[PDB]
Amino acid sequence: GLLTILKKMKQKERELRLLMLGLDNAGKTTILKKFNGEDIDTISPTLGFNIKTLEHRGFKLNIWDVGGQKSLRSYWRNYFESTDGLIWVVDSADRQRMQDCQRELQSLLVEERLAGATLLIFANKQDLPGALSSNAIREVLELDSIRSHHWCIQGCSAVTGENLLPGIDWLLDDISSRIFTADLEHHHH
Amino acid sequence: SSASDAEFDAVVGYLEDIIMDDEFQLLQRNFMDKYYLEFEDTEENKLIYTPIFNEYISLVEKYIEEQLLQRIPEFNMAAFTTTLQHHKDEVAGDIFDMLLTFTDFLAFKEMFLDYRAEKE
Ligand SMILES: Nc1nc2c(ncn2[C@@H]2O[C@H](COP(=O)(O)OP(=O)(O)OP(=O)(O)O)[C@@H](O)[C@H]2O)c(=O)[nH]1
Numbered sequence: 179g180l181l182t183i184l185k186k187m188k189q190k191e192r193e194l195r196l197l198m199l200g201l202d203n204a205g206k207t208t209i210l211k212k213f214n215g216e217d218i219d220t221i222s223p224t225l226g227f228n229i230k231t232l233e234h235r236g237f238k239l240n241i242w243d244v245g246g247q248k249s250l251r252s253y254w255r256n257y258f259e260s261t262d263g264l265i266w267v268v269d270s271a272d273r274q275r276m277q278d279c280q281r282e283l284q285s286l287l288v289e290e291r292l293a294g295a296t297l298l299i300f301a302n303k304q305d306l307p308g309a310l311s312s313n314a315i316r317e318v319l320e321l322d323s324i325r326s327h328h329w330c331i332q333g334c335s336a337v338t339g340e341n342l343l344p345g346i347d348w349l350l351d352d353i354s355s356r357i358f359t360a361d362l363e364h365h366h367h
Numbered sequence: 368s369s370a371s372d373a374e375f376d377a378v379v380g381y382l383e384d385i386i387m388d389d390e391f392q393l394l395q396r397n398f399m400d401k402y403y404l405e406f407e408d409t410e411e412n413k414l415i416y417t418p419i420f421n422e423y424i425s426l427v428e429k430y431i432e433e434q435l436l437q438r439i440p441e442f443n444m445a446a447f448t449t450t451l452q453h454h455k456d457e458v459a460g461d462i463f464d465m466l467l468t469f470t471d472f473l474a475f476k477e478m479f480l481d482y483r484a485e486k487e
Pocket residue numbers: 200201202203204205206207208209221222223224225244245246247267302303304305306334335336337338
């Protein structure tokens with residue numbers, strides 16, 4: 179009612195809401211942790227969700243990581259509300275469930291509660307010998323040919339923390355540039 | 368002003384009154400007072416915190432409007448909202464900044480953890 183609308187009207191300008199989703203084991207919680215420089219050597223599969231408030235490039239980023247287990251995916255949309263950017267994390271080594279990765283993503287892109295978020299896809303576990311090439315993950319998931327959202331693919335290793343920044347750095351460029359055109363078209367009308 | 372810029376400001380008066388009252392502490396105390404149990408002191412949040420959090424918000428604001436008319440009969444929350452929700456950017460005050468504290472989830476989790484800690 180009131181409080182829900184109030185907050186969405188006087189919402190902070192440089193505060194960004196980031197939702198991290200993707201099949202279990204992918205490495206979502208590994209990314210969050212290995213972003214604040216926390217210890218990855220302790221991560222147990224998440225049954226709930228972690229919120230890691232964190233500043234970067236003038237923004238403060240409220241990042242929600244929700245458990246990716248198959249029996250938890252129904253409750254995923256309790257966190258769709260007010261999402262500024264959607265981080266889809268892929269275990270690029272488990273090619274057997276890549277079929278599944280496509281279905282769950284294509285069902286997210288058409289949610290209308292996420293209709294505005296910018297899509298960042300993390301082709302994680304690139305350090306592994308069995309890891310598929312980003313382009314092979316691109317034709318899989320049918321990443322292109324989606325006229326829904328602005329997107330970018332980023333092959334990364336969450337253990338070494340390689341290519342995690344190039345993705346988040348891009349995400350802001352997109353989100354902020356989307357907010358640029360907000361003010362631009364606002365004041366001129 | 369002039370004409371029902373009062374109405375609004377006269378409602379603001381209570382968006383201090385009501386929420387600074389020790390009776391607001393009760394309904395909170397009482398609502399929290401039925402899940403001390405189900406609030407673990409870990410950084411990972413339970414999937415069930417969200418449905419409780421939404422019940423919490425729809426109780427705070429459900430109380431706020433049934434209190435605004437215990438003082439201003441002929442008060443319409445839907446009429447108050449709509450107009451307020453734009454045509455008086457006499458919002459922004461150190462007033463609703465208080466009122467959207469309840470939308471902050473981590474501030475809710477922290478104060479909820481303080482309650483289970485207290486009765487243990
Ligand atoms: N080799 C390798 N392993 C990784 C990498 N990133 C994550 N892992 C491993 O993947 C496993 C799962 O990590 P999680 O962070 O729990 O993955 P998740 O997607 O959050 O799993 P859910 O909580 O079920 O959603 C862990 O054992 C990690 O060590 C990586 O970049 N390289």
